[PDB]
Design a protein around this nucleic acid. Structure first.
Length: 184
DNA sequence: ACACAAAATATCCAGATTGGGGACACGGTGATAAACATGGA
């Protein structure tokens, strides 16, 4: 019934992106249209999930929160083709209750790692050229839930590029032995 | 009170040796709290 008047308006909710509630100033609602809200019911599936952690004195991998990666699709027709093989070729290495790749230190690690995976699949899946032709921007979100409230830490969105390919190999052979080489 | 003259050649260290032995801390702990947002009749 709501979808009949797709041009009409209705309030948002905390299930989707939050902020259109109190608004931190004035008791005023938000502006939106109905059919846009309906499309936001499936954006979570495409999102990539990474698990961050904080070093303690004993070196235990104290996992806390999650890191979410959101891609900015440029070509809808091309984007829907590469992903079926990208998600089907993930590393199966397991470390305790988490995969090896699921453990990252800084939020930028997860977003940059996604670019490495896509280009390798681009080299495998023909018909695709540069990364920019498929992805325009990458969103990085750090979130954590405590009690009845959810606390945000960092929201970033900056310039995916292709000159960082060597960086992933530079850290695989270097960060394996120590734990403080992440600073460089 | 006048004048004249006020040094010259050789030489200025040679050997042997510059540390040895033992030891470089012991235990106990490495924050604790309070500060909500959406739904159905």
């Amino acid at each position: 019934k709501s979808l009949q008047n797709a041009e009409k308006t209705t309030g948002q909710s905390g299930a989707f992106y939050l902020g259109a509630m109190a608004v931190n100033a004035e008791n005023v609602s938000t502006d939106d249209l109905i059919k846009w809200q309906f499309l936001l019911h499936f954006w979570a599936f495409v999102a990539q999930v990474y698990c961050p952690y904080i070093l303690d004195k004993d070196g235990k991998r104290n996992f806390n929160g999650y890191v979410i990666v959101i891609p900015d699709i440029a070509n809808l027709e091309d984007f829907c083709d590469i992903l079926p093989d990208v998600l089907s070729n993930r590393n199966s290495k397991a470390f305790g209750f988490r995969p090896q790749e699921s453990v990252i230190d800084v939020p930028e690690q997860g977003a940059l790692e996604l670019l490495n995976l896509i280009k390798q699949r681009i080299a495998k899946k023909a018909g695709s050229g540069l990364l920019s032709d498929l992805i325009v921007g990458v969103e990085v979100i750090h979130a954590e839930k405590q009690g009845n409230s959810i606390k945000l830490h960092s929201v970033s969105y900056l310039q995916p590029n292709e000159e960082s390919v060597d960086d992933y190999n530079a850290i695989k052979n270097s960060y394996y032995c120590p734990w403080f080489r992440r600073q460089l």
